[PDB]
UniProtKB/Swiss-Prot annotation, chain A:
Its main location: cytoplasm. Keywords: Cytoplasm, Isopeptide bond, Ribonucleoprotein, Ribosomal protein, Ubl conjugation. The chain holds residues 57 to 149 of 149 of the full protein. Belongs to the universal ribosomal protein uL15 family. The lineage of its organism: Eukaryota, Fungi, Dikarya, Ascomycota, Saccharomycotina. This is Large ribosomal subunit protein uL15.
From Swiss-Prot, chain B:
Component of the large ribosomal subunit (LSU). Mature yeast ribosomes consist of a small (40S) and a large (60S) subunit. The 40S small subunit contains 1 molecule of ribosomal RNA (18S rRNA) and 33 different proteins (encoded by 57 genes). The large 60S subunit contains 3 rRNA molecules (25S, 5.8S and 5S rRNA) and 46 different proteins (encoded by 81 genes). eL18 interacts with NAP1. The chain holds residues 15 to 148 of 186 of the full protein. It comes from Saccharomyces cerevisiae (strain ATCC 204508 / S288c). The modification N6,N6,N6-trimethyllysine is found at residue 36. Component of the ribosome, a large ribonucleoprotein complex responsible for the synthesis of proteins in the cell. The small ribosomal subunit (SSU) binds messenger RNAs (mRNAs) and translates the encoded message by selecting cognate aminoacyl-transfer RNA (tRNA) molecules. The large subunit (LSU) contains the ribosomal catalytic site termed the peptidyl transferase center (PTC), which catalyzes the formation of peptide bonds, thereby polymerizing the amino acids delivered by tRNAs into a polypeptide chain. There are 2 genes for eL18 in yeast. This is Large ribosomal subunit protein eL18A. The gene is RPL18A. It is found in: Cytoplasm. The lineage of its organism: Eukaryota, Fungi, Dikarya, Ascomycota, Saccharomycotina. One of its GO terms (biological process) is cytoplasmic translation. Keywords: Cytoplasm, Isopeptide bond, Methylation, Ribonucleoprotein, Ribosomal protein, Ubl conjugation. The keyword Ribosomal protein applies. There is a cross-link at residue 102 (Glycyl lysine isopeptide (Lys-Gly) (interchain with G-Cter in ubiquitin)).
UniProtKB/Swiss-Prot annotation, chain D:
This is Large ribosomal subunit protein uL4A. It comes from the Eukaryota. It is found in: Cytoplasm; Nucleus. Belongs to the universal ribosomal protein uL4 family. It comes from Saccharomyces cerevisiae (strain ATCC 204508 / S288c) (Baker's yeast). Disulfide bonds: none annotated. There are 2 genes for uL4 in yeast. N-terminally acetylated by acetyltransferase NatA. Component of the large ribosomal subunit (LSU). Mature yeast ribosomes consist of a small (40S) and a large (60S) subunit. The 40S small subunit contains 1 molecule of ribosomal RNA (18S rRNA) and 33 different proteins (encoded by 57 genes). The large 60S subunit contains 3 rRNA molecules (25S, 5.8S and 5S rRNA) and 46 different proteins (encoded by 81 genes). uL4 is associated with the polypeptide exit tunnel. uL4 interacts with its chaperone ACL4 and the nuclear import receptor KAP104. The lineage of its organism: Eukaryota, Fungi, Dikarya, Ascomycota, Saccharomycotina.
From Swiss-Prot, chain E:
Signal peptide: none annotated. The modification Phosphothreonine is found at residues 137, 145. This is Large ribosomal subunit protein eL13A. Component of the large ribosomal subunit (LSU). Mature yeast ribosomes consist of a small (40S) and a large (60S) subunit. The 40S small subunit contains 1 molecule of ribosomal RNA (18S rRNA) and 33 different proteins (encoded by 57 genes). The large 60S subunit contains 3 rRNA molecules (25S, 5.8S and 5S rRNA) and 46 different proteins (encoded by 81 genes). The lineage of its organism: Eukaryota, Fungi, Dikarya, Ascomycota, Saccharomycotina. It comes from the Eukaryota. InterPro entries: Ribosomal_eL13, Ribosomal_eL13_CS. One of its GO terms (cellular component) is cytosolic large ribosomal subunit. Belongs to the eukaryotic ribosomal protein eL13 family. It is found in: Cytoplasm. Component of the ribosome, a large ribonucleoprotein complex responsible for the synthesis of proteins in the cell. The small ribosomal subunit (SSU) binds messenger RNAs (mRNAs) and translates the encoded message by selecting cognate aminoacyl-transfer RNA (tRNA) molecules. The large subunit (LSU) contains the ribosomal catalytic site termed the peptidyl transferase center (PTC), which catalyzes the formation of peptide bonds, thereby polymerizing the amino acids delivered by tRNAs into a polypeptide chain. The keyword Ribonucleoprotein applies. It comes from Saccharomyces cerevisiae (strain ATCC 204508 / S288c).
RNA sequence: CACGGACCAAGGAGUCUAACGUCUAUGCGAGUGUUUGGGUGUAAAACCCAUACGCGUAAUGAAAGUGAACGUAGGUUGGGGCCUCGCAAGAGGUGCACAAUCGACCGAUCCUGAUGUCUUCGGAUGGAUUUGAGUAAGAGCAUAGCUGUUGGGACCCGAAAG
RNA sequence: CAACUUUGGGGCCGUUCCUUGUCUAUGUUCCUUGGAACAGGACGUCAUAGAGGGUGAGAAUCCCGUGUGGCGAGGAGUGCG
């Protein structure tokens, strides 16, 4: 396509994450209690950026347990699925 | 039609000695199939995920049979629930092993299987996929 | 401590012990289970006789 | 249980204290894997030979 | 398939084969040791600051940087010329543009000045029984960005609309700026 | 840049053989032969015929 | 036909490697890889290790980008093996892997064009086919081995030359 | 303008580095062979010394060294007591 000379491949780190895995980020001792205890006001929060995952993709389905995610980039369906399970997304840069 | 496998894992060879015993004697089809399966190579003994076990358990009239995978067993992070079953294979990943015991079920080796169900009784076999390879 | 157990894992980062693929080394115990001997269709002889 | 072991003195006797095993001893025996490792380790104290 | 050698050239001369590895390691460990016996009570390494790294692929991280700044160390209450002797790096061509980092660095410096004893130039020089790494003693940890548990709050935009619309107006502001120019240049 | 641009054959048997110099028989050109060249050039005549 | 061979000893010719590929063995498994390197030591060994990084778990398009479940992860057929009945022989239910077939989803292409809008932006919803090595509940990482491809001096000796 | 703070320059002995010296245990007992014992057999000893070498053949224990330590001389330049 159109060229931009000395292109340096760091704009394009976009490690994807599907909605499937998404509790391996959480350690087990937290994971089971937060697998139960599906209230609001203990909303287990997730830093995909800290785990090294840039953008969310949706392949999977998730329980209705509400969980908060931090990311930059999302797809529409994945966000809608989150809203259905009662978790919310908050965009960090 | 092969005679004896390519490795020298001694324990597997003892196991195969046993299954030769059964497929010589009893004439079930079951022992033949697992023995033939053990002679395969590693690609052709693919790994089977516990989600696939759960789909097979979700069969009609299938909750109380024992599943068999011949090969190696994986964990799968995707399912969250899992039933409480009696499961047999050669090699168990620890995550999946503990997943099963967390469900409450039992994980066994094939000597223990052959103790319990020699003839292939109340049993069924799975096999993982192969078409993911080019 | 150093090689793990059922109680205490390895003393080592991200390690478990191995596992067996067969519980018991000896097969002949298995074959002389009462249940398998009941389950078996009976033997040959291991010496065939010279016929013609 | 881990069945027991005896313990000995220097001069040697059945010291009355006894230990259980650590369950590595009930871990397997794979001589193919020992051997194919042992080649590869015993190779590693090697230094060059060239012309 | 396409497969690439670079072996067309006279490569056999210029081959460099690291058998030298443990011998070098031992030489090195001896360097460390005798540096210690030269510098006897000091740690073999300086105190180094905490810096948030560049290049958004990495910019979540934080790293053991080079040097505490003049502003930081001034607010700690002590000069470059003294700090460099006390064991403290200083990088002068750096600027402080995050107060969080600023207070982090100065907390690190205060913790240093608390954790030390300084033999003066006068004399008797008590026994001090050295420790051999500043950065181990004064670790450099990624902070807590968030508390583990929260309650949900929503505003109903759902953030895909925001991302799409932000990218769109980013694409179209300059053309909308040209239309604004045309609307301003009308009569 | 453009301006800058610019016989006596001998069957080599008997006495003449192994002489890395000249034989008795002198001329400014000279060419020693043994039978292996006859084999070689026979083979080359064959293969060039097969190349035509 | 032609070429080599007087006679004996000793020497002597598909090897070492780099990047890939298949097959197999082993480990481990949504992961995997300790060895650039730090500590440690009976010292080039052995043992332990964070933080990283690769390769993989997601493609698609030239890009901007966008990013995979209507379902019980689908329907039909076959489908080993199990289960039930059957003295059996046989029937029926289940039917993994796999194959075919029809669909669904993602991406690309064309049209449609909703709540709204710097009134030109956004892109709801539904259609049209053609396409991917996709998805459709993962399978790969590392090593060694037998090996093959190409380059390196390249199975060994040998060539007019600059 | 305001107060505060801090100063160094040698020689001597040890230490350090280098070079070097020197000292730092244990059978040469018996039997057989054979030219000879370092071989074989028996009984012993030492070990932080069984690494190597020699000596009339494979020598821990005949020797030199090694291992662990210590007593020195010469230089250097001060890392500090």
């Amino acid at each position: 396509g159109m060229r931009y000379f000395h292109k340096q491949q760091a704009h394009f780190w976009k490690p994807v994450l599907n909605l499937d895995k998404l509790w391996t980020l959480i350690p087990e001792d937290k994971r089971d209690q937060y697998l139960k205890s599906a209230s609001k006001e203990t909303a287990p929060v997730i830093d995909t950026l800290a785990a090294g995952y840039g953008k969310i993709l949706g392949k999977g389905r998730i329980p209705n347990v509400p969980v908060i995610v931090k990311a930059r980039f999302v797809s529409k369906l994945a966000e809608e699925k989150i809203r259905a399970a009662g978790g919310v997304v908050e965009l960090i840069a | 039609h092969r005679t004896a496998p390519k490795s020298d894992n001694v324990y597997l060879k003892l196991l195969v000695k046993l299954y030769t015993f059964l497929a010589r004697r009893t004439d079930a089809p079951f022992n033949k199939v697992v023995l033939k399966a053990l002679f395969l190579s590693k690609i052709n003994r693919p790994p089977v995920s516990v989600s696939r076990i759960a789909r097979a358990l979700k069969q009609e009239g299938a909750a109380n049979k024992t599943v068999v995978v011949v090969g190696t067993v994986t964990d799968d992070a995707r399912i969250f629930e899992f039933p409480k079953t009696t499961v047999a294979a050669l090699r168990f990943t620890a995550g999946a092993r503990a997943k099963i015991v967390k469900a409450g079920g039992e994980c066994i080796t094939l000597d223990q299987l052959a103790v319990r169900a020699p003839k292939g009784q109340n049993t069924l076999i799975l096999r993982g996929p192969r078409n993911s390879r080019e | 401590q150093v090689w793990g157990s059922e109680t205490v894992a390895s003393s080592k980062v991200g390690y478990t012990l191995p596992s067996h693929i067969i519980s018991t080394s000896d097969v002949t115990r298995i074959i002389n289970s009462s249940e398998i001997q009941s389950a078996i269709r009976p033997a040959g002889q291991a010496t065939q006789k010279r016929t013609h | 249980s881990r069945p027991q072991v005896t313990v000995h003195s220097l001069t040697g006797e059945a010291t009355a204290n006894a230990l259980p095993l650590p369950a590595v001893f009930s871990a397997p025996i794979r001589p193919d894997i020992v051997h194919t490792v042992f080649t590869s380790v015993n190779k590693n104290k090697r230094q060059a030979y060239a012309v | 398939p396409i497969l690439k050698n670079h072996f067309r050239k006279h490569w056999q001369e210029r081959v460099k084969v690291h058998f030298d590895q443990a011998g070098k390691k031992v030489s090195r460990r001896n360097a460390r040791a005798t540096r210690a016996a030269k510098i006897a009570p000091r740690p073999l390494d300086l105190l180094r600051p905490v810096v948030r790294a560049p290049t958004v692929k990495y910019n979540r991280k934080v790293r053991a940087g080079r040097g505490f700044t003049l502003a930081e160390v001034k607010a700690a209450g002590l000069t470059a010329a003294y700090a460099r002797t006390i064991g403290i790096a200083v990088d002068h061509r750096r600027q402080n543009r995050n107060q969080e980092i600023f207070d982090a660095n100065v907390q690190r410096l205060k913790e240093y000045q608390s954790k030390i004893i300084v033999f003066p130039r006068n004399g008797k020089a008590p026994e001090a029984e050295q420790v051999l790494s500043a950065a181990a003693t004064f670790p450099i940890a990624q902070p807590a960005t968030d508390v583990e548990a929260r309650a949900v709050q929503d505003n109903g935009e759902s953030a895909f609309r925001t991302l799409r619309l932000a990218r769109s107006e980013k694409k179209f502001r300059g053309i909308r700026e040209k239309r604004a120019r045309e609307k301003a240049e009308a009569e | 840049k453009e301006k800058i641009k610019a016989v006596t054959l001998v069957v080599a048997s008997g006495r003449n053989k192994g002489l890395a110099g000249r034989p008795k028989g002198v001329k400014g050109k000279y060419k020693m032969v043994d039978g292996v060249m006859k084999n070689e050039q026979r083979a080359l005549r064959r293969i060039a015929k097969k190349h035509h």
